């Protein structure tokens, strides 16, 4: 074992679907629901962006016609309901491509050792904790009266949560429902189960005729440059990429954690778009740890093992540096 294989790849073991938005009333949330649609709109603003002091004197008093889209609850429905689902697959049966064979055997051995040592329970508990606190509400969460989350596996309706009573910086390990859901997730992670299905439904009492925030599409067009929101089967929704980014926000073992005190999404270099700096630009990156684990055999600390397996669950293309 001299270096990483010339072609190694993984796949994500946590596959989410597209969320769908429905509006209803809180007292009748278990019975009926109504569709939520996206409405086009046009605005007329003033040129207030930072301009050079030459153009500013010429077009300070100019109008600004712009296009946009918006979503808004109706005048008699005050509850927002979001439904989606998760599929869980074993980590071992997810290495789609590996050119080498000794590296594959070593990776399997290290994964088996990690399963025997810990059991994939810390990451499972952290993921279920991220589910329970409803972090998936990037914007809508703010200014909510009541947040309620319900998790169902196949037919067993687990008791509801209360995401308002959950800190977004601390992780809870003392909860029976969280314990059993995370235990089943860890069972599917290790290899004891072939697959797992989870269904999530969240009710938010955002208020009457308030504004909800669907996901925004990334499109390019020469004429139009406005805001386009995500339409899913004629209803507003959220992308699966956006939901997955909230779930994998478990990284609390990065360097200089005591200076920041907030979890970040797990990435190869610890980069987060919110902060603008990489937290692992050095020997704490995933590549250096995987070289210090597989190539040169060395028992890494438990936190680095957690980070490495968390990267592996995320998936990617962790191949060797390709050369001409």
């Amino acid at each position: 074992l001299k270096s990483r294989p010339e072609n190694l790849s993984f796949a994500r073991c946590l596959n989410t679907t597209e969320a769908k938005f429905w509006q209803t009333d809180f007292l009748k949330r278990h019975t009926f629901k109504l569709p939520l649609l996206i409405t086009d709109k046009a605005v007329l603003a003033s040129k207030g962006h930072e301009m050079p002091p030459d153009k500013l004197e010429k077009e300070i008093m100019d109008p600004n016609p712009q296009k946009s889209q918006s979503c808004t609850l109706s005048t008699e429905c005050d509850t927002l309901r979001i439904d989606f689902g998760i599929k869980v697959l074993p980590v071992k049966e997810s290495m789609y491509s590996c050119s080498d064979y000794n590296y594959r055997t070593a990776i399997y051995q290290k994964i088996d050792e990690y399963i025997a040592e810990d059991g994939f329970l810390t990451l499972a508990k952290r993921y279920v904790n991220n589910i329970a606190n409803a972090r998936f509400l990037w914007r809508n969460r703010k200014g909510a009266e009541i947040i309620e989350t319900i998790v169902t596996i196949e037919d067993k309706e687990y008791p509801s949560f209360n995401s308002k009573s959950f800190n977004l910086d601390t992780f809870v390990e003392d909860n029976a429902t969280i314990n059993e859901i995370a235990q089943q997730i860890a069972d599917t992670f290790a290899g004891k189960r072939e697959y797992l299905n989870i269904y999530v439904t969240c009710f938010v009492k955002i208020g009457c005729a308030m504004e909800v925030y669907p996901s925004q599409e990334m499109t390019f067009d020469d004429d139009d440059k406005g805001k386009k929101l995500f339409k899913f089967e004629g209803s507003a929704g959220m992308h699966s990429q956006k939901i997955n980014n909230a779930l994998r926000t478990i990284d609390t073992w990065y360097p200089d954690y005591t200076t920041y005190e907030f979890p970040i999404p797990v990435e190869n270099y610890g980069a987060a778009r919110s902060i603008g700096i990489p937290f692992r630009p050095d020997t704490k990156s995933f590549y250096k740890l995987i070289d210090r684990m597989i190539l040169k055999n060395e028992d890494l600390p438990i936190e680095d093992k957690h980070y490495v397996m968390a990267i592996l669950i995320r998936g990617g293309m962790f191949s060797k540096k390709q050369e001409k």
Partner: protein, 340 residues
């Protein structure tokens, strides 16, 4: 008149002769790096080291039931370098003069006016012509990732493929679709810097192609009606907490109008054919009894759905009540009086 074009290309403060020198000392050093190709890699992903390409030459059999490159259109070869540091020959041969053709065509036939202009401007036109006119055509040596590789079942064994895109075919298709009326897509998901870093001048000048729109018929697209067809309704009357249920049986007279009302004010304007109706299953009712402490239905009772399945109802434990036969045909005839 290429001298002022060369001067405009250079963006330095040096004298015009020095601009010409800076322009010319790069061309004969970049001639070797420029190569000729047909299926050049890095089109799917520019993060690919080296230059990989096939340069298909064979062209025959315009009778088979399939289309590929080099048998259709194929009126301009790919001139592709390794990177954008030395992309000079593509723009050098891409200019046009007052006559109306390109510099490469004049190089091929050795135009006299361009020859004397080069002799006035320099003394190394022959080396440039020899470098360009028979430039090497390279082979696709080696492979890496960023290239789509698949497995194909050849006989009982398997073959590994190394799929490559034909950019000259893409450019030809873009031109033909520009001069056509078939439905098409623009696909402008690219930038000038990225297209420059591909190294192929055919995609560097055709940044946003034209693509066939291969789609199913229009009336097979999802909308709000199709999504709402798959959703069903259940009543708001929880029989678990309701008084007078007697372990889940309609027991008192003075509750039937409420149930008829609930089935009445919820199934209006929801009539659908049988293929859109939710199908009643034998396992849901059995689960209902088993949950509610029964194995077979008691004598004198028949199952009934509060919201009819014919009017957008759902088959579940919620939309299910057990009740006597007389009340059954009473509710049935009331609903027939309302709907049909």
């Amino acid at each position: 008149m290429l001298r002022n074009k060369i001067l405009a290309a250079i963006s330095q403060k040096i004298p015009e002769e020095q601009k010409i020198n800076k322009y010319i000392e790069g061309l004969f050093q970049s001639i070797d790096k420029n190569h000729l190709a047909t299926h050049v890699a890095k089109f799917t992903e520019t993060n690919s080291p080296g230059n990989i390409g096939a340069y298909d030459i064979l062209s025959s059999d315009m009778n088979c039931g399939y289309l590929d490159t080099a048998n259709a259109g194929w009126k301009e070869p790919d001139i592709v370098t390794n990177d954008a540091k030395y992309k000079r020959p593509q723009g050098f041969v891409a200019m046009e003069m007052s006559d109306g053709r390109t510099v490469m065509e004049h190089l091929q036939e050795d135009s006299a006016e361009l020859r004397h202009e080069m002799e006035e401007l320099t003394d190394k036109y022959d080396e440039i012509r020899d470098g360009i006119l028979n430039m090497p055509s390279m082979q696709p040596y080696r492979t890496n990732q960023f290239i789509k590789q698949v497995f194909f079942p050849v006989g009982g064994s398997y073959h590994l493929l190394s799929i490559l895109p034909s950019t000259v075919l893409n450019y030809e298709v873009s031109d033909r679709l520009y001069r056509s009326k078939i439905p098409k897509i623009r696909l402008r998901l690219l930038s000038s810097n990225a297209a420059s870093t591909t190294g192929s001048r055919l995609v560097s000048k055709n940044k946003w192609p034209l693509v066939f729109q291969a789609l199913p018929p229009k009336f097979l697209e999802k909308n709000l009606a199709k999504a709402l067809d798959k959703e069903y309704l259940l009543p708001d009357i929880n029989i678990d907490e309701l008084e007078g249920v007697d372990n889940g049986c309609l027991i008192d007279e003075a509750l039937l109008p409420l149930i008829i009302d609930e089935g009445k004010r919820k199934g209006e304007g929801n009539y659908r054919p049988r293929h859109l109706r939710d199908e009643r299953k034998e396992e849901t009712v059995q689960a209902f009894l088993d949950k509610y402490g029964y194995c077979n239905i008691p004598v004198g009772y028949e199952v009934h759905h509060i919201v009819p399945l014919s009017q957008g109802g759902a088959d579940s434990i919620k939309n299910m009540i057990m009740l006597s036969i007389e009340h059954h045909e009473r509710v049935t005839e009331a609903h027939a009086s309302y709907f049909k």
